[PDB]
Amino acid sequence: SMEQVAMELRLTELTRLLRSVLDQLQDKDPARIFAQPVSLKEVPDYLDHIKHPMDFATMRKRLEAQGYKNLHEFEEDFDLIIDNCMKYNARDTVFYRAAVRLRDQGGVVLRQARREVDSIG
Numbered sequence: 223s224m225e226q227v228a229m230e231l232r233l234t235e236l237t238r239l240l241r242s243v244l245d246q247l248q249d250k251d252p253a254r255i256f257a258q259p260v261s262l263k264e265v266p267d268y269l270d271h272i273k274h275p276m277d278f279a280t281m282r283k284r285l286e287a288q289g290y291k292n293l294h295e296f297e298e299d300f301d302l303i304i305d306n307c308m309k310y311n312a313r314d315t316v317f318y319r320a321a322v323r324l325r326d327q328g329g330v331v332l333r334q335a336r337r338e339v340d341s342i343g
Contacts, residue, residue: 236291243331243335244296247328256324272310275302300328304324
């Protein structure tokens with residue numbers, strides 16, 4: 223139907239906007255600490271601690287399949303990246319500290335993303 227096509231176009235357009243958001247957030251991780259999944263070869267107990275792992279590569283896979291239906295779903299995955307890191311790692315670590323800085327810098331980008339998503343519909 224035409225209604226289904228129009229809904230598909232809206233999802234494609236959201237996908238384009240989320241890809242720009244993802245690129246902007248990932249620039250706030252210049253050390254690439256969050257670029258890839260925590261390796262279970264290297265951190266074999268990770269899944270005993272963290273029940274829903276997340277990372278930027280995994281979000282990019284989901285995004286390119288158009289698997290984010292709305293900005294809430296995308297933000298949920300970004301907050302998992304931060305929140306997982308701040309539980310597994312202590313305050314005095316480069317990991318924890320990178321997550322704080324990504325959270326603080328990302329909030330700015332996400333504040334305007336929410337306005338754009340709402341504005342454009």
